[PDB]
Amino acid sequence: GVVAAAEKTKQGGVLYVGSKTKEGVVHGVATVAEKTKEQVTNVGGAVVTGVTAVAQKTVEGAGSIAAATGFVK
Amino acid sequence: GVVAAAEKTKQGGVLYVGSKTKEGVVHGVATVAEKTKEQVTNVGGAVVTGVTAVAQKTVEGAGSIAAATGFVK
Amino acid sequence: GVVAAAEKTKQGGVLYVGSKTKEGVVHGVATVAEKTKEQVTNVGGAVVTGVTAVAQKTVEGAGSIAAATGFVK
Amino acid sequence: GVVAAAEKTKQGGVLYVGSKTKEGVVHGVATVAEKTKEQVTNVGGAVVTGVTAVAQKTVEGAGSIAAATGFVK
Amino acid sequence: GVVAAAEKTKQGGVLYVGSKTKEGVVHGVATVAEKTKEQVTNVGGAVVTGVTAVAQKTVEGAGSIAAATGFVK
Amino acid sequence: GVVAAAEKTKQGGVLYVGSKTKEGVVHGVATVAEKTKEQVTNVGGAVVTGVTAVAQKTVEGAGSIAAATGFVK
Amino acid sequence: GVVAAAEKTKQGGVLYVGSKTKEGVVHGVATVAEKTKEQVTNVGGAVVTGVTAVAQKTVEGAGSIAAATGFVK
Amino acid sequence: GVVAAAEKTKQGGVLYVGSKTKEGVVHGVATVAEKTKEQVTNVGGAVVTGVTAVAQKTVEGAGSIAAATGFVK
Amino acid sequence: GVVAAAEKTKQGGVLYVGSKTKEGVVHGVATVAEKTKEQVTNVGGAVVTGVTAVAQKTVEGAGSIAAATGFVK
Amino acid sequence: GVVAAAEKTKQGGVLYVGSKTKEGVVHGVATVAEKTKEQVTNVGGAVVTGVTAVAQKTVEGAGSIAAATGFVK
Amino acid sequence: GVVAAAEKTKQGGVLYVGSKTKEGVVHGVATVAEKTKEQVTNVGGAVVTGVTAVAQKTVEGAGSIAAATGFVK
Amino acid sequence: GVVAAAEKTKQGGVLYVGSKTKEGVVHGVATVAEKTKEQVTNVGGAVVTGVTAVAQKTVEGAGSIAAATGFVK
């Protein structure tokens, strides 16, 4: 029994990034496996991958994740 | 039994990014596997992948993910 | 039994990106597998993939994902 | 038993992107597999793939995804 | 029995980053395994991976994660 | 029985980073294993990985993680 | 007084080149100048310019070059 | 007074090159100048310029170059 | 008074090169100058410029160069 | 008075090179100057410039160079 | 008075080089000067410049160089 | 009065080099000067410059160099 819920209610900066680079290799949420059974990936928020990665005010409300795996019984 | 719910109710910046690069290789939510049974990917939020990746005020309301996997019984 | 629901109710910036690059290779939500049974991909939010990837105010209401996989019994 | 629902009710920016590049290869939601049984892809939100990918105010209401896979019994 | 909940209610900076680099290799949430059974990755907050990674005011409300794995009985 | 909850309610800087480098290799939350059973990764907060990694005012509200693993009985 | 002379009298190999490349820029006998008076180029032999440049038994007889420049008196 | 002469009289190999490269920039006999008077280039032999440059038995007879420059008197 | 002469008279190998590279910049007989009077370049022999440069049995007979420059008197 | 002469008379190997590299910058006979009068370059022999530079049995006969410069009187 | 002469008369190896490198910068016969009068470069022999530089049996006969510079009188 | 002469008359090895390196900077016959009058460079023999520099049986006959500089009188 997997349940989830969320509720958001609303009754209503000179950021500078300078990047100079060469030969960038970036892996973000790599999951490397061999001879498994189950692989689960739940993303309820920001995943910002780059060579330049800027996030501003991104994840600002009511997140919920519910996971259940296996249960051989 | 997998249930989910969400509710959003509304009763109603000189950001600068400069990027100079060469030869960019970016993997974001890579999931590499061999000889599995089940692979699940739930994205309820931002996945921003790039060489330049900018996210502003992205995920701002009422997210919900419910996953159940396996259950051999 | 897989159920989901969502409800949104409404009773109603000098962002600059400069990119100079060469030879960009970007993989976003790659899922590489071999000899599996089941592969599920649910996208209820933003997936922004690029060499330049800009997201502004993207995912701002009432998301819901419900997944169930397997159940051999 | 797979059910879903959604309800949206409404009782009613000098963004700049400059891109200069060469030889861009971009894969967005690639799912590579071999010798499987089932492959499911549900997109209820934005999938923005490019060399330049800009998303503004995209996914702003009442999303719902319900998936069930397998069930050998 | 896996349950989760979250509630957010609202009744309502000269940051400078200069980066000069060469040959950057970055792995963020790598999980390398062999001959397993189960792999679970729940992201309810920020995962910012880059060569330059800037996060400002990112995760500012009502996060909840509930996970259960195994249960051979 | 795994439960979680969170509630956020709101009734309402000349930072400088200069980086010059060469050949940066960064691993953030690497988890390397062999011949396991279960691998769980719950991220409810910031994971900022880079060669330059700046976080400002990131995780400022109502986090909750509940995990249960094993239970052979 | 510029004189030249030449006389040739005749009283009568598993070479392998493999080249694999990308983005080749080759300048051979470039002579870049500004605000000059005189520019002389005498070629009495081989000038072999390429990305792959193979010369075999090329310049095998009786070369002569005589040059005189200037002489303001 | 510039004189030259040459006389050739004739009274009559598993070489392997393997090249794999990327982004080759080659300048051979570059002569860069500014605000000069005289520029002389005499080539009586091999000039082999390339990314792969192979010369075999090239310059095998009777070369002669005679140059005189200036002589303001 | 510039004179030259040459005379050639004739009364009549498992070389292996393997090159694997990336980003090669090669300058051979560069002569960089500013505010000069005279520039002379006499080539009576091999000039082999490349990323891979192989010369075999190249300059095998009777070379002669005679140069005179200046002579303001 | 500049004279030269040469005379050649003829009365008639498992070399292995393996190169693996990256980012090669090679200058061979660079002559950098500013505010000069005279620049002379006489090449009567081998000039082999490369990232891989192999010369075998190259300069095997009768070389002669005669140069005179200046002579203001 | 500059004279030169040469005479060659003819009355008629498991060398292994293995190189593995990265970021090679090589200057061979660099001559850097400022505010001069005269610059002379006579090459009558081998100049082998590289990252890998192999010379075998190169300069084996009858070399002669005669230079005279200055002579203000 | 500058004279030179040379005469060559002919009346007729498991060498192993293994190099593994990183970041090599090599200057061979550098001549750095400022506010001079005369610069002379005579090469009648081998100049082998590299990161790996192998010379075998190179300079084996009849070399001669004669230089005269200055002579203000």
Length of chain A: 73
Q: Do the beta carbons of residue C70 and residue A71 sit within 8 Å?
A: no
Going by beta carbons, is chain J in contact with chain C, meaning 3 or more pairs sit under 8 Å apart?
A: no
The structure tokens listed for E59 are 């995760």
Q: Closest partner residue to C35 among B5, B11, B35, by Cβ? A: B35
**Cβ atoms within 10 Å, residue I43:** 29
Q: L24 - beta bridge partners? A: K24
Test mutation, E11, E14, E17, E35, chain A, max A CBs within 10 A: E17
If you count them, how many residues does chain K have?
73
Contact C17, C36 (CB under 8 A): no
- For the sheet with L31-32, list strands across it: G31-32, H31-32, I31-32, J31-32, K31-32, L31-32
- The set of residues, in sequence order, having a beta carbon less than 8 Å from that of B64 and lying 6+ positions away, is A4, A5, A6, A44, A64, B4, B5, B6, B44, C63, C64, C65
Which of F53, A63, I51, G46 is CA-nearest to residue H55? G46
CB-CB under 8 Å, J42 with K43 = yes
Q: Is H73:H16 a contact under the CB 8 Å cutoff?
A: no
Consult the annotation and say whether L66 binds a ligand.
no
Six-digit token pair at E35?
């001959």
Quick one: tokens of I15?
């070389």
Can you tell me the distance from the alpha carbon of J33 to that of L41, in angstroms, rounded to the nearest whole number? 14
State how far the Cα of I68 lies from the Cα of G66, in Å rounded to an integer.
12
* Pairwise CA distance, residues J14 & J30, whole Å: 33
What kind and span of H or E run contains B20? strand B16-20
**J19 contacts H21 by C-beta, under 8 angstroms:** no
Please state, in angstroms and rounded to a whole number, the distance separating the CA atoms of residues E4 and B3. 11
Q: CB distance H43–G38 less than 8 Å?
A: no
**E18 token code pair:** 């200069």
**Joined tokens for residue B6:** 């969400």
Nearest beta carbon to residue I36 from set H28, H36, H66: H36
Q: Distances from the Cα of A69 to the Cαs of B38, B69, D2, E38, F40, in angstroms?
A: 11, 5, 19, 8, 10
CB contact under 8 A, I15 and J53: no
Q: How wide is the angle at C-alpha J16 spanned by C-alphas J14 and J17, nearest 5°?
A: 160
Alpha helices in G1-73 (DSSP H): none
Q: How far is CA A72 from CA A69, C71, E34, E38, L67, in A?
A: 9, 10, 21, 12, 93
The Cα of B18 is separated from the nearest Cα of chain A by a number of Å equal to 5
What's the half-sphere exposure (Cβ side, CA atoms, 13 Å) at C8? Answer: 20
- Which residues in chain J are contacts of K53 at CB distance < 8 A? 53
Chains K and L touch (3+ CB pairs under 8 A): yes
Interchain CB distance below 8 Å, G45 and H48: no
Q: Are E19 and E51 in contact (CB under 8 A)?
A: yes
Residues 34-73 of chain I with CB under 8 A from chain J are: 34-73
Q: How many CB atoms lie under 10 A from the CB of residue K21? A: 22
Which chains are adjacent to chain K, needing at least 3 Cβ pairs under 8 Å? J, L
How far is F58 from L27, CA to CA, in rounded Å? 51
From CA F23, how far away is CA E24, in angstroms rounded?
A: 6
Say how far residue B2 (Cα) sits from the centre of its chain: 20
Q: Could you tell me how far CA I15 lies from the centroid of its own chain? A: 23
Closest CA to I55 of H26, G55, J62, H27: G55
Selected for mutation to probe chain F from A65, A71, A72, A73 (highest F CB count within 10 Å) is A65
CA neighbor of G24 nearest in space, from F38, H16, K36, H20: H20
Token pair in block for residue C62: 């009432």
**Residues in chain C closer than 8 A to A38 (CB atoms):** 70
Distance, in Å, from the CA atom of C53 to the CA atom of B52, rounded to the nearest integer, reads: 6
Residue count of chain D = 73
**String of b and e for J16-36 (b: at least 16 CB within 10 Å)?**
bbbbbbbbbbbbbbbbbbeeb
- Residue F34 burial (C-beta neighbours within 10 Å; 0-12, 13-18, 19+): exposed
Residue A59 DSSP code = B
Distance from CA of J36 to the nearest CA of I (A): 5
Residue of C nearest to D73 (CA): C73
**Residue at L15: amino acid letter:** L
Helix H or strand E segment including C42: strand C38-43
Give the CA angle between residues A59, A61, A65 to the nearest 5°. 85
Calpha distance L36→K34 (Å, rounded)? 7
Distance from CA of C63 to the nearest CA of B (A): 5
Distance from CA of residue H6 to its chain's centroid? 17
C-alpha distances (whole Å) from J13 to each of B47, I7, I14, I15 are 60, 31, 6, 7
Residues F42 and E42: their CA atoms lie apart, in Å, by 5
Q: Do C67 and B15 touch (CB under 8 A)?
A: no
- Three-state SS for G42-58 is EECCCEEECCEEEEECC
Contacts of residue B24, Cβ cutoff 8 Å, sequence gap at least 6: A24, A26, A51, B51, C21, C23, C24, C25, C26, C51
Angle at A47 between CA A46 and CA A53, to 5 degrees: 105
Instruction: Identify the residue whose tokens are 């009365």.
Output: J11
SS3 readout for chain L: CECCCCEEEECCCCCEEEEECCCEEEECCCEECCCCCEEEEEECCCEEECCEEEEECCECCCCCEEEEEECCC
What is the C-alpha to C-alpha distance for residues B65 and D44, in angstroms, rounded to an integer?
13
Q: Do H15 and I56 touch (CB under 8 A)?
A: yes
CB contact under 8 A, G58 and H53: no
Q: What is the DSSP string of H31-58?
A: EE-SS-SEEEEEE-S-EEESSEEEEES-
Q: At A45, give phi and psi (nearest 5°).
A: -125, -160
- Which SS3 state, helix, strand or coil, does residue B16 take? strand
CA angle L21, J26, H51 (to 5 degrees): 105
The answer to whether the CB atoms of L53 and K53 lie below 8 A apart is yes
Q: Hunting for tokens 């280039």 — which residue is that? A: H41
Across the interface, of D19, D54, D59, the residue whose CB is closest to C59 is: D59
Tell me how far apart the alpha carbons of residues K14 and C3 are, in angstroms, rounded to a whole number: 76
- Residue length of chain G: 73
d(CA K70, CA L71): 6
Say whether B34 sits in a helix, a strand or coil: coil
The C-alpha atoms of residue E25 and residue J67 are separated, in whole angstroms, by 55
Experimental technique behind these coordinates: cryo-EM
Q: Is D3 helix (H, G, I), strand (E, B) or coil?
A: coil
Going by C-alpha positions, the residue among J27, J69, E36, L32 that lies closest to residue H29 is J27
In angstroms, the separation between the Cα of residue D19 and the nearest Cα of chain C is: 5
> Whole-angstrom Cα distance, residue A5 to residue D3?
16
Q: Nearest CA of chain E to the CA of F49: how many Å?
A: 5
Q: Report the distance separating Cα H29 and Cα H35, nearest Å.
A: 19
Distance between CA atoms of residues I16 and I34, nearest Å: 42
Measured over the CA atoms of residue H3, residue H8, residue H13 and residue H14, the dihedral's sign is positive
Q: Please indicate whether, in this complex, the C-beta atoms of H71 and G71 are within 8 angstroms of each other.
A: yes
Closest-CA residue of chain C to D59: C59
Alpha-carbon gap, residue C65 to B44, rounded angstroms: 7
Query: How far B42 CA sits from the closest chain D CA (Å)?
Result: 9
Please report, in range form, the residues annotated as the binding site of D for Cu cation: 27
What are the structure tokens assigned to H65, written together?
């170059």
Element (H, E) at D1: none
As a whole number of angstroms, the distance between CA L22 and CA C33 comes to 37
* Nearest residue of I to residue J52, measured between CA atoms: I52
Up-side HSE of residue A46: CA atoms within 13 Å toward CB? 42
Determine the residue type at L1.
Answer: G
**CA torsion D31→D32→D37→D40, rounded to 10°?**
10
Gap sites in chain A (C to N > 2.5 Å), preceding residue numbers: 12
